[PDB]
């Protein structure tokens, strides 16, 4: 159900997430 | 299909 961030989200740059 | 961002 949820997408939570693994690292700090960044302006104008992609970052890593995981589904839970 | 849809997942919500926390």
């Amino acid at each position: 159900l949820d997408i939570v961030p693994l690292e700090e989200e960044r302006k104008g740059n992609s970052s890593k997430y995981r589904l839970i | 299909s849809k997942y919500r961002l926390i």
Epitope: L6, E7, E8, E9, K11, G12, R18 | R4, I6
Partner: antibody, heavy 119, light 112 residues
Framework: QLQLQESGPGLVKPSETLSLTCTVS????????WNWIRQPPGKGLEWIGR???????YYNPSLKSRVTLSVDTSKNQVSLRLSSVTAADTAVYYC?????????????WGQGVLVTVSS | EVVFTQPHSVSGSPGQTVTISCTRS????????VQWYQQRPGRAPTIVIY?????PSGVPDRFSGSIDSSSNSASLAISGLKSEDEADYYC??????????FGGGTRLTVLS
């Protein structure tokens, strides 16, 4: 916002290791990140480093040699260990954890623990 | 390497609008989000602005964040100034390695 149970010694002797912890109560220790900050009383904010759930660590170059950041998912806590301390490391230390009431997140800081370094 | 410099002191009378600037020394300020922290004496810093211009619930609409890529600066504007707004203010952003960098801090006085 987040109650974050920050804990540490009031007093640490030089060349000991100063160690602090913070814990979460929402079950989230396996995700997100922690930032660590400190403030010499009456001076500005200095960032120490970050540990996150990629399990990358980020450090202030001034301190990287002396800093260890760790997460114990069993105790639901982060720990900061700062080695080879001097009286110049006397500061209020803060842990910062992201608070997410929805899709957006902003950081919530601990109460602050003043560590005095003195032999 | 990169620093964010702030005025040491900003002052204004009740009802006036005050601005606190935060200028980045190298690289584009607009490349990383800018946060603004408020610190009342003896208490931990709390967010008043995050992601350049977003306000937590519980922070008045009197607080405004802005970005100016021409001056390479961020600004925190507080309108309708009140005695409760008296505090220290820190900008927080990041460098090309994603390490946090704080501004030097600004003491805001509500002139009485």
């Amino acid at each position: 916002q987040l109650q974050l149970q920050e804990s540490g010694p009031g007093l640490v002797k030089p060349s000991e290791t100063l160690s602090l912890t913070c814990t979460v109560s929402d079950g989230s220790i396996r995700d997100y990140w922690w930032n660590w900050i400190r403030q010499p009383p009456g001076k500005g904010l200095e960032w120490i480093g970050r540990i996150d759930s990629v399990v990358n660590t980020y450090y202030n170059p001034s301190l990287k040699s002396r800093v260890t950041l760790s997460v114990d998912t069993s105790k639901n806590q982060v720990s900061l260990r700062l080695s080879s301390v001097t009286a110049a490391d006397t500061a209020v230390y803060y842990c910062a954890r992201p608070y997410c009431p929805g899709s957006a997140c902003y950081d919530s800081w601990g109460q602050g623990v003043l560590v005095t370094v003195s032999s | 390497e990169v620093v964010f410099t702030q005025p040491h002191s900003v002052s204004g009378s009740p009802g006036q609008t005050v601005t606190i600037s935060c200028t980045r020394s190298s690289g584009s300020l607009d490349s990383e989000y800018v946060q603004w922290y408020q610190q009342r004496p003896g208490r931990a810093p709390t967010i008043v602005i995050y992601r350049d211009n977003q306000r937590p619930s519980g922070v008045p609409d009197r607080f405004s964040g802005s970005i100016d890529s021409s001056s390479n600066s961020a600004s925190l504007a507080i309108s309708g100034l009140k005695s409760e707004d008296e505090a220290d203010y820190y900008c927080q952003s990041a460098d090309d390695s994603y390490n946090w960098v704080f501004g030097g801090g600004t003491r805001l006085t509500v002139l009485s």
